[PDB]
Write a protein that binds this ligand. Structure first.
Ligand SMILES: NC(=O)C1=CN([C@@H]2O[C@H](COP(=O)(O)OP(=O)(O)OC[C@H]3O[C@@H](n4cnc5c(N)ncnc54)[C@H](O)[C@@H]3O)[C@@H](O)[C@H]2O)C=CC1
Ligand SMILES: Cc1cc2nc3c(=O)[nH]c(=O)nc-3n(C[C@H](O)[C@H](O)[C@H](O)COP(=O)(O)O)c2cc1C
Ligand code: SF4
Ligand code: FES
Lengths: 430, 213, 63
């Protein structure tokens, strides 16, 4: 297959994405959830890991790490410490709202994914770290967990397999930096949400010092469907090493901003013109697209024509798939103001533990405010580029890279706009 | 906005605060949710529960949480100052938070901000003299496809115009509670031009199950 | 109120590569001397994972 897209409704992972059906246990069990889970738990953790890694499923958090190897990292005999599975339900990245829909309208899929993953790596329990803002979603998730507990699906002797598995929900307290796995682990332990240094990896020392595997909501909820339908069916979609389906949140300057499930290698133009109803003012009015949320750089209208929405094609285009969050800006947008607002967001959401991000992101915030106002000189522009090269790769966590990348993308694709703004300010003020 | 504390007469360690017995039972359940020897992992919910009893956190719930969890109070101070939800200053009855990040700014959230500022007669970070509304600015709240959007207390009000947020403020001032949903035609996140996907009924159990399972 | 002295060798500091050269120079010039051995730091055992132990007292209360 060379052309991708137009996914049929029978192949969608997340049926009832929009909440049109019952989200409770009766409604979820009638859609195929919680079906033959005992066979999955009894066929073996190695069988589950093999079925996961055969499908070519990658991490849906944004890193794109292969989840089969990551889940098999902690598939080791115990040394007296318990093992833990942790679900990352923070979703603080701008443009990304898919996990909210997953935990609001399909919570039993998340619970079954927690059980299947915990059996896959021998985890004692599941700690779902939900966002603090998502109070109603957390209440719905706890209601579904209570329904699963009452029906005997989770808890002592889960689904009649002899495996004991608990599911816990921990509410956050409004921190974007707590979305990253090590900072999330420290946040569960009742400390400041400051990321750890790897090594040690969470598979060796994680939450409470126990071995821990942190996985996204989307990459957990697909695993029961992986075990039931099979890995080859999931591998049939998408290109090589880009297999499966993806939840895309299209927002910004579009006709119909929406969350939709589609294939992995869909062209961006086809996806926007089909599911979002096209951008405002037609495709000739498009200025820029951020394809993977605020952590990824933008691409201009020329790049957007023949780009595929998977990991490899966007890495080739000097960007990343990220969380598959398409923010669209038309030609009536002050894009420098948008990038300055993104850098201000990164300055306000920064844990401040390590020096390069803590000073540099504030430095880019000040110089991008000056760039928006035009009170700068062109020789600063390359200097700002160098500042980005002093943040990317020299930080504890990846918030520094995710703050340096939008500045680099904005500079690379719109240096003439910034130079025109600076020369206009110099003409009008001197 | 200061990250240091000065003993005001209304905010001091001698300010009376104590948990209600039902809140105490909730605290016991929360600390039973965690393994033994790691009781400090319950610092994050329990302290928040104290705010849920008061609406704000003086430095007497900080010391009480430190006392009932056997942790030093400096760790509780670190936790309360690090996270943005913990109100160390007494906010009004309805804490309006307007998202002004780039995906919400692209859909004209500043118009909502100035509409609320004109209706309530206050500024960003100010409180009404009746102690009813507190208007501040927040980052992305995870409903970017429903931009523009505000959050009032625990509820989300999305897909708003200035008229819709004025009606929300009018309903809140009258003593009622509105419906926490998008103000447009769509229900949660579907496209406004009808369902572009998931139109077919779901298949049900046993569909596509591989052999040997 | 300045600092006056009557000792000429007050500012004399001599640098030697090893201890034996200093000992030979002191014995050659006839100076009665004392020598104290070099104190090197003992090699420590550092582990970043020890800050996140499961049952040991070396857990950090904050980071
Ligand atoms: N989903 C979201 O809300 C956001 C996602 N992102 C994206 O996430 C990524 C940055 O996040 P990270 O967690 O730092 O990604 P990545 O550097 O860490 O690694 C992903 C996972 O693989 C594991 N891993 C990688 N190499 C390993 C090895 N050799 N041994 C053992 N484990 C190994 C890590 O422990 C981690 O669990 C970027 O791609 C960024 O675009 C960025 C911001 C927000
Ligand atoms: C600053 C920052 C914030 C992050 N926020 C989230 C998040 O909110 N949700 C999420 O699933 N991953 C987030 N991540 C990515 C995680 O580090 C990690 O990749 C994820 O929890 C698990 O990835 P996986 O899909 O491969 O299992 C964030 C990363 C960084 C650097
Ligand atoms: S890069 Fe920034 S957010 Fe990440 S550890 Fe360093 S200071 Fe914290
Ligand atoms: S950008 Fe406003 S909710 Fe995400």
């Amino acid at each position: 297959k060379t052309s991708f897209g137009s996914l049929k409704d029978e192949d969608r992972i997340f049926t009832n994405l929009y909440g049109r059906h019952d989200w409770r246990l009766k409604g979820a069990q009638s859609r195929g959830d919680w079906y033959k889970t005992k066979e999955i738990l009894l066929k073996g953790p190695d069988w589950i890991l093999g079925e996961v890694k055969t499908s070519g499923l990658r991490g849906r958090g944004g890193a794109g790490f292969p989840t089969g190897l990551k889940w098999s990292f902690m598939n080791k005999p115990s040394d007296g410490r318990p093992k833990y599975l942790v679900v990352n339900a923070d979703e603080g990245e701008p443009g990304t709202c898919k996990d909210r829909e997953i935990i609001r309208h399909d919570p039993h899929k998340l619970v079954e994914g927690c059980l299947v993953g915990g059996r896959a790596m021998g985890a004692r329990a599941a700690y779902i770290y939900i966002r603090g803002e998502f109070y109603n979603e957390a209440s719905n998730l706890q209601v579904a967990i209570r329904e699963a507990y009452e029906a005997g699906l989770i808890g002592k002797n889960a689904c009649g397999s002899g495996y004991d598995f608990d599911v816990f929900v921990v509410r956050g307290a409004g921190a974007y930096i707590c979305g990253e796995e090590t900072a999330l682990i420290e946040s569960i332990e009742g400390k400041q949400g400051k990321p750890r240094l790897k090594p040690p990896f969470p598979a060796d020392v994680g939450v409470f010092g126990c071995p821990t595997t942190v996985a996204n909501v989307e990459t957990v909820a697909v695993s029961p469907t992986i075990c039931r339908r099979g890995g080859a069916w999931f591998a049939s979609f998408g290109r090589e090493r880009n297999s499966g389906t993806k939840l895309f949140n299209i927002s910004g300057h579009v006709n119909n901003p929406c969350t939709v499930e589609e294939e992995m290698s869909v062209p961006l133009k086809e996806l926007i013109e089909k599911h979002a109803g096209g951008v405002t003012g037609g495709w000739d009015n498009l200025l820029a697209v951020i394809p993977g949320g605020s952590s990824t750089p933008l691409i201009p209208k020329s790049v957007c024509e023949t780009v595929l929405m998977d990991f490899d094609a966007l890495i080739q285009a000097q960007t990343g798939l990220g969380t598959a969050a398409v923010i669209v800006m038309d030609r009536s947008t002050d894009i420098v103001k948008a990038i300055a607002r993104l850098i201000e967001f990164y300055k306000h959401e920064s844990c401040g533990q390590c020096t390069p991000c803590r000073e540099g992101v504030d430095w880019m915030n000040k110089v991008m405010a000056r760039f928006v106002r035009g009170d700068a000189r062109p020789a600063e522009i390359d200097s700002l580029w160098e500042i980005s090269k002093q943040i990317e790769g020299h930080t504890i966590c990846a918030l520094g890279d995710g703050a340096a990348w939008p500045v680099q993308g904005l500079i690379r694709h719109f240096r003439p706009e910034l130079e025109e703004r600076m020369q206009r300010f110099a003409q009008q003020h001197q | 906005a200061l990250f240091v504390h000065r003993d005001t007469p209304k905010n001091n360690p001698e300010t009376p605060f104590d948990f209600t017995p039902e809140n105490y039972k909730r605290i016991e359940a929360i600390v039973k949710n965690y393994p033994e020897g790691h009781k400090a992992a319950a610092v994050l919910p329990v302290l928040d529960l104290a705010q849920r009893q008061n609406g704000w956190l003086p430095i007497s719930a900080m010391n009480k949480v430190a006392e009932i969890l056997q942790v030093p109070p400096m760790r509780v101070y670190e936790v309360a100052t690090f996270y943005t939800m913990y109100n160390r200053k007494p906010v009004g009855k309805y804490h309006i938070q307007v998202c002004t990040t780039t995906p919400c700014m692209l859909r004209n959230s500043d118009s909502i901000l100035e509409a609320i500022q004109k209706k309530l007669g206050i500024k960003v970070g100010e409180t009404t003299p009746d102690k009813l509304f507190t208007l501040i600015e927040v980052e992305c709240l995870g409903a970017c496809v429903n931009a523009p959007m505000v959050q009032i207390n625990d509820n989300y009000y999305e897909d708003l115009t200035p008229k819709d947020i004025e009606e929300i403020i009018d309903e809140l001032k009258a003593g009622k509670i509105p419906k926490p949903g998008p103000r447009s035609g769509r229900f949660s996140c579907e496209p406004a031009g009808g369902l572009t996907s998931l139109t077919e009924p779901p298949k049900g159990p046993g569909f596509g199950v591989q052999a040997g399972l | 109120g300045w600092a006056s002295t009557a000792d000429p060798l007050s500012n004399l500091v001599l640098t030697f590569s090893t201890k034996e050269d200093a000992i030979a120079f002191a014995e050659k010039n006839g100076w009665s001397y004392d020598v104290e051995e070099r104190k090197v730091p003992k090699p420590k055992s550092k582990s970043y994972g020890a800050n996140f132990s499961w049952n040991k007292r070396t857990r950090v209360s904050t980071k």
